[PDB]
Chain A
Amino acid sequence: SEFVHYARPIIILGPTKDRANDDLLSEFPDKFGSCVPHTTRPKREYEIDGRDYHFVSSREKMEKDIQAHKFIEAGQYNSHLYGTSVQSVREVAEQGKHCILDVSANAVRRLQAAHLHPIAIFIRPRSLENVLEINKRITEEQARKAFDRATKLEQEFTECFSAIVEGDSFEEIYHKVKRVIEDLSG
């Protein structure tokens, strides 16, 4: 443990977080990776089990694993369960790549409780108009909604974010994001 250090999984929250998640995996494929989630949906014939998803045969068993606290974030969509498991985050991180995560803010303590202490970054907009600045592809109704949801997220989870990132542009946001990971890399 003194010589080799596991790569800390990464949870970026807030406006443009998916654009940051896309960009980081693109810019450094050997440093950042994605983890395979489980679903109870049946696979299409071009989806590859164990690589695109882990396809769960017994849907009854997935909720047994969910109640055994085997997932950090679970969910349903179109009648099918979805979820990132703890073992799927450990597999990326043990390759020493930072695992890029689409989890809610609630998954931070469960990763911590599982000792996979993530870098939790909150992108914080400074106004409605500021959301319009760092995301020039949303309508005001989407911006106002983006701004309120951000406000509630900081109120409830401000204490679990390793860094809060601000800027007048995604370029500025994305720079500071990359540097937080540098200063918390290890």
Chain B
Amino acid sequence: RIRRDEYLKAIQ
């Protein structure tokens, strides 16, 4: 999860 902040960031 911490290596995918861009994903996490895209979902919001």
**0/1 interface trace, chain B 1-12, chain A, CB 8 Å (1 if under):** 111101111110
Chain A contacts with B in 12-28, Cβ cutoff 8 A? 18, 21-22, 25
**0/1 interface trace, chain A 68-94, chain B, CB 8 Å (1 if under):** 000001011110111110000000000
Pick the contact of B11 from A25, A34, A53, A102 — CB < 8 Å? A102
Q: Are B7 and A39 in contact (CB under 8 A)?
A: yes
Instruction: Give CA–CA (A102, B1) in the complex, Å.
Output: 9
Q: Are A102 and B3 in contact (CB under 8 A)?
A: no
What A residues does B6 contact at CB under 8 A? 39, 41, 77-78, 80, 82
Chain A residues within CB distance 8 Å of chain B: 18, 21-22, 25, 34, 37, 39, 41, 47, 52-53, 73, 75-78, 80-84, 100, 102-104
